[PDB]
Amino acid sequence: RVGLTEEQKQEIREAFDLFDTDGSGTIDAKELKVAMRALGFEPKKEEIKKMISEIDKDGSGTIDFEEFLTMMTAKM
């Protein structure tokens, strides 16, 4: 079923915090690339850029918790 129960939201928050290794408050594009490598992805510049742009409503090169949460809500 599509949905984020509190437990999933907690997991997403923990993951977010971890991926924000810098502790910037936002995951930098590079940290997101590292995260995607941790997720076992194969980055491709154009796809990465476009996906990042879609998620990056406001975070301007970084991804805020809410933006990351939105991504996670969409992708699961």
Structure-solving method: NMR
Which residue numbers belong to the known binding site?
20, 22, 24, 26, 31, 56, 58, 60, 62, 67
Number of domains in the chain: 1
CATH of the domain at 19: 1.10.238.10
Other C-beta atoms lying within 10 Å of the C-beta of residue 18: 12
The answer to whether 27 and 19 are in contact (CB under 8 A) is: yes
Distance CA 37, CA 8 (A): 21
Distance CA 53, CA 23 (A): 21
Residues in the chain: 76
Which residue numbers belong to the known binding site for Ca(2+)?
20, 22, 24, 26, 31, 56, 58, 60, 62, 67
Which run of H or of E encompasses 26? strand 26-28
Distance CA 25, CA 63 (A): 9
| Structural domain boundaries, residue 9 | 1-76
The answer to whether 29 and 61 are in contact (CB under 8 A) is: yes
